[PDB]
Design a protein around this nucleic acid. Structure first.
Ligand SMILES: [Mg+2]
Ligand SMILES: [Mg+2]
Ligand SMILES: [Mg+2]
Ligand SMILES: [Mg+2]
Ligand SMILES: [Mg+2]
Length: 1032
RNA sequence: GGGUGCUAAGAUUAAUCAGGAUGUUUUUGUACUCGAAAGAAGCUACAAAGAUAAGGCUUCAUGCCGAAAUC
DNA sequence: GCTTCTTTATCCTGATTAATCTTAGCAC
DNA sequence: AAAGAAGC
């Protein structure tokens, strides 16, 4: 090509390694690590989950706001201030079934029913009220001992049952009350039972939201998943065709038929021979690949035909125009009256839409007015439901338009698609990623593109841009072993489905009716087959009759919880009874089994799992690992995204170096080659630091021009002492506001004297959720040994503390530690609060004075006698000032929670008044000059004035509000400090704990902000502006 | 040998929507403790009602936005 | 003031669209 | 991982 320099890229989810070198000389021209922690984009799972949770709560709250207006307009209640909140609504929901209720009694019964409306895929009040009476509790997920055994209940009931009940209640009230109109009953049942459709989403005509049906643009779709249909591989503004469309069925077969080799004089079929094979299968009612190959065996010996698509086992495959044949079995319609485009569109709607309303609305809106009658669409919706397996197979990679350009050529040429398409025929990173919905893959892509752009303008274009790719070379033996594993996987499902059918019907296939609204049945049945038809936490057998007809009773548990592992694979999944998944909670089977009331023992499972031959190896490893794993310790999704991001860029480059015709070669390397060259070559990848990314990339760049002094020189320059300390680093700064603001925990406070306090102080409460776990007793003892007066029971109920709790710690085992409280309960059941008659309630939790309230967010109810707070408030940015008078620096701290939505405007901002506020509390003189703002991962040089010493750090935040001008810093060259690292004299060693927290408000110290381009070229930025930037 | 295209499967995962049951905390009621009661205490449990990222929107409702990306 | 060290909410049900790797069968 | 009060 033009010049002599080859760039290498090692693209990851949070880093892209960079490296340039002369193909000829072997000199290394540039080395670089670009870092942008993926942790922030994977947070979007946190982001979706909370957004959806916010909508369920909003609508549950609105369900009772809606019921308020219903009650006013009916004239039943106007004044909602004297409504009592201490009646028993569950007793009124059973009383109103036969006897009259007060208008306010009725409001209480309906309001309570609306707050828990049940699932929707003896009335419940009666069952609830009797759980209240015999067990003293209704809600949640609790244990009950019956006839010697322990069972588990939950407050889950079907919405249809709440509907039946409310209908009976309001009807008998209608006997007694004349204001209970039929419209009142109807509109309440809408509030009660009303659900939005999954293909509509949020909003209404007035409330436009681009999350749902009624868009901000003014358009209102029929199905919000229509706009997510992929686009054509070649005509990129055309949507793709349904796999059940005619155009797709014709193209698929045609391309199949031109891919076989026949004994004909051409070795390939003719235009005429094709046309009646199409005509043959299109008019034959029964059809499969075998019957088809039996017929061109007639149209010419079947075993002499070659080139057919193969099955996992080997039972050859070919297209059959299956969708068209079974559509032709419609009676109210004919599948032949319709031209090409009205059958392709019928496939579009029947593929996308899955329910009556979605189908019925699409046909009206996208077919001419008189194209279908009520009985005709009646059959189509029954036809679609009876054939969800055919219309759930998705969408072709091609649009209809492109296939129309190809289809006649496939009739004519005997060429297959590819040879047909060939015969006829800087990068904008934002447009490249405009329609990729994976913020992790999308970000690593833009980071990689933005690097090559900057690499060209500082170095001109390249001869080669090399990209490491996570792909596999395999020889014959490995390959066979893959498809045997892939075969055993499909064999296992069919074996499971067959065993499911025999034990349900006796027949060998299961009716389609069972899979409606339970599309996941196949995988559940597969798990059910792996587990020997047994729930591995309770030990009860699971019968497909319950699994299909009472499918509520079961849930698919993540063995090692997703909160901790993020393992969504089949090996991290079992099918268990619902109540056992719930009690297991966020725990492994090991952590949870023996603690569960309605469950096996862990030894009985340790038995069954290895006595079992159906369970996977990986699945057994997960079911039994005694590892106290948790959320804060030191996955597959990361590999998916590396390949996705690496591929997207690689293709986006070779497209760029073709269409604009610069012809920079674009090559590729695998990890198996680089990782072993690293072993064969010298480079020793060092510990826990970002240097290895730049070296990874250079090894990538070298692996290409390896077909060749210079081979020597390059590896010399690589393994040299003066190399690792010459690598440059550039981090992506995070300036985004309105991130997660604090911890989720809602903390109570009390006034008390603790330790060396003789004036009352405000204390934040903690709570031991369950004293009967060892983690609960462990926490108990730490507090007990340090200060028993911390437990509020010690202070406000000393009878229980010294007459009930203290004796237990005397008379119970404690040891392999064990929990004395749990032993007691194995004896007497739940520790009861002290009383004279044995009357007291049970004890599960103990709250304690924890720490003094410091920095917080105030969420105190107007109700409350004590403040309620959120804590661990997260920072946004730090504004650095200097004060000429004192000579010292003054660092202000901004947090996400300091910005808010301004009421009148709706804008998200901080006002100058409150900003100038934070200025005074932080110790910043009003007559000091702003200098530069610091955001996350901005770099800083901290220069010592006393000595000549200086050091470069990267910023994390302004830390510890009480200690003014205190900031926490992270290293320039790696992720974290180990602890005790030497710094400049004035700052001293970083704390041995690991966190570098230092106050920068001293007298002899110079600090400058530093920026880098994405290549690691830094430039000092001593002053930024006159005033802090606050534009919103 | 890499790259890529059509198809089918196997294995992973991403985006988005509709829902359930909790958990946290406030207040009240009841039980428990104290008091002769009224009550007190706010521990401990159940229930209900309110709040549930701080906080906002307008179109009064199957109402809408608020933890990603934009650097 | 400087360092240490405790602390940190979740389990599911139903659905659609998309991507990546790996086997296959054809092909520039 | 990092907030920030506890601890000295
Ligand atoms: Mg689970
Ligand atoms: Mg705790
Ligand atoms: Mg009281
Ligand atoms: Mg935190
Ligand atoms: Mg603390």
């Amino acid at each position: 090509m033009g010049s002599d320099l080859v760039l290498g890229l090692d693209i990851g989810i949070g880093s892209v390694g960079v490296g340039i070198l002369n193909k000829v000389t072997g000199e290394i021209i540039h080395k670089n690590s670009r870092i942008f922690p993926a942790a922030q984009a994977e947070n979007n799972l946190v982001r979706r989950t909370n957004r959806q949770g916010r909508r369920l709560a909003r609508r549950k709250k609105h369900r009772r706001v809606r019921l308020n207006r219903l009650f006013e307009e009916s004239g039943l209640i106007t004044d909602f201030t004297k409504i009592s909140i201490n009646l028993n609504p569950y007793q009124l929901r059973v009383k109103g079934l036969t006897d009259e209720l007060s208008n306010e009694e009725l409001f209480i019964a309906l309001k309570n029913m609306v707050k828990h409306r049940g699932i929707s895929y003896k009335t419940p009040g009666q069952i609830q009220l009797e759980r209240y009476q015999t067990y003293g509790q209704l809600r949640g997920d609790f244990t009950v001992e019956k006839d010697g055994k322990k069972h588990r209940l939950i407050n889950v009931f079907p919405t249809s049952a709440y509907r039946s009940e409310a209908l009976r209640i309001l009807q008998t009230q209608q006997e007694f009350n004349p204001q209970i109109t039929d419209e009142f009953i109807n509109r309440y049942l809408e509030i009660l039972t009303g659900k939005r459709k999954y293909y509509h989403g949020p909003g209404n005509e007035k409330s436009r939201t681009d999350y749902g049906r009624y868009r901000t643009s003014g358009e209102t779709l029929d199905n919000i998943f229509g706009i997510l249909i992929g686009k054509c591989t070649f005509y990129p503004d055309e949507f793709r065709a349904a796999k059940a469309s005619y155009t797709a069925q014709e193209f698929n077969l045609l391309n199949d038929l031109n891919n076989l080799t026949v004994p004909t004089e051409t070795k390939k079929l003719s235009k005429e021979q094709k046309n009646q094979i199409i005509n043959y299968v299109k008019n034959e009612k029964a059809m499969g690949p075998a019957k088809l190959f039996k017929y061109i065996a007639k149209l010419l010996d079947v075993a002499d035909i070659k080139g057919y698509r193969i099955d996992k086992s080997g039972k050859a495959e070919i297209h059959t125009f299956e969708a068209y044949r079974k559509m032709k079995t419609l009676e109210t319609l004919d599948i032949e009256q319709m031209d090409r485009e009205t059958l392709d569109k019928l496939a579009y709607v029947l593929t996308l839409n899955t329910e009556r309303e979605g189908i019925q609305e699409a046909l009206e809106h996208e077919f001419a007015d008189g194209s279908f009658s009520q009985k005709q669409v009646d059959e189509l919706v029954q036809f679609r439901k009876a054939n969800s397996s055919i219309f759930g197979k998705g969408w072709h990679n091609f649009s209809v338009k492109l296939m129309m350009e190809l289809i006649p050529e496939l009739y004519e040429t005997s060429e297959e698609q590819m040879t047909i398409l060939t015969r006829l025929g800087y990068i904008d990173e934002k447009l490249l990623t405009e329609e990729i919905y994976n913020p992790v893959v999308a970000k690593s892509v833009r980071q990689a593109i933005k690097i090559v752009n900057a690499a060209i303008k500082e170095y001109g274009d390249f001869d080669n841009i090399v990209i490491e790719m996570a792909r596999e070379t395999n020889e014959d033996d490995e390959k066979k072993a893959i498809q045997k594993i892939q075969k055993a996987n499909k064999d296992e499902k069919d074996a499971a489905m067959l065993k499911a059918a025999n034990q349900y019907n006796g027949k060998a296939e299961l009716p389609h009716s069972v899979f409606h609204g339970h599309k996941q049945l196949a995988t559940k049945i597969r798990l059910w087959h792996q587990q020997g038809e047994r729930c591995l936490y309770t030990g009860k057998t699971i019968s497909i009759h319950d699994l299909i007809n009472n499918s509520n009773q079961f849930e698919v548990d993540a063995i090692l919880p997703l909160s901790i592992t993020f393992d969504d694979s089949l090996a991290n999944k079992v099918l268990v009874y619902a109540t056992a998944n719930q009690e297991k909670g966020q725990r492994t089977p090991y952590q949870a089994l023996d603690s569960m009331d309605d469950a096996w023992s862990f030894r009985e499972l340790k038995a069954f799992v290895r006595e079992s031959k159906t369970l996977s190896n990986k699945k057994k490893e997960y079911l039994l690992t005694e590892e106290d794993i948790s959320k804060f310790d030191v996955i597959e999704r990361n590999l998916v995204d590396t390949r996705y991001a690496s591929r997207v860029v690689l293709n986006a480059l070779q497209e760029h170096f073709r269409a604009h015709k610069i012809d920079t070669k674009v090559s590729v390397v695998r990890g198996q080659f680089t990782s072993q060259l690293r072993r064969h070559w010298g480079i020793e990848k060092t510990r826990d630091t970002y240097h290895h990314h730049a070296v990874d990339a250079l090894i990538i760049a070298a692996s290409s021009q390896l077909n060749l002094a210079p081979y020597q020189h390059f590896v010399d320059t690589l393994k040299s002492k003066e190399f690792e300390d010459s690598i440059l680093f550039s981090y992506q700064v995070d300036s985004k506001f309105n991130r997660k603001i604090s911890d989720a925990t809602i903390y109570a406070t009390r006034q008390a004297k603790v330790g060396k306090d003789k004036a009352d102080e405000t204390y934040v409460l903690g709570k031991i959720k369950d004293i009967y776990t060892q983690d609960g007793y462990d926490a108990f003892m730490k507090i007990y040994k340090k200060d028993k007066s911390k437990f509020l029971m010690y202070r406000h109920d000393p009878q229980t503390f010294e007459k009930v709790i203290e004796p237990i710690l005397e008379n119970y085992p404690n040891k392999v530690p064990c929990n004395p409280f749990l032993k007691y309960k194995e004896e007497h059941g739940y520790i009861r609060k002290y009383s004279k008659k044995g009357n007291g309630p049970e004890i599960k939790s103990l709250k304690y004075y924890d720490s003094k309230l410091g920095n917080h967010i105030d969420i105190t109810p107007k109700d409350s006698n004590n403040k309620v707070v959120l804590q661990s408030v997260s920072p946004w940015r730090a504004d650095v000032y200097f004060n000429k008078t004192t000579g010292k620096y003054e660092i202000l701290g901004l947090k996400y929670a300091d910005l808010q939505f301004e009421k009148g405007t709706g804008t998200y901002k901080i006002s100058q008044e409150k900003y100038n506020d934070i200025k005074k509390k932080e110790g910043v003189d009003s007559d000091s000059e702003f200098k530069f703002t610091l955001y996350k991962n901005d770099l800083l040089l901290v220069k010592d004035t006393e000595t000549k010493e200086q050091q470069l750090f990267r910023f994390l935040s302004r830390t510890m509000p009480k200690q003014k001008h205190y900031v926490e810093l992270k290293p320039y060259d790696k992720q974290k400090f180990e602890g005790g690292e030497a710094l400049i004299k004035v700052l001293g060693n970083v704390a041995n704990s690991g966190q570098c927290k230092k106050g920068l408000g001293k007298s002899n110290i110079s600090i400058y902000k530093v920026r880098t381009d994405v290549l690691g070229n830094q430039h000092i930025i001593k002053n930024e502006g006159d005033k802090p930037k606050l534009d919103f």
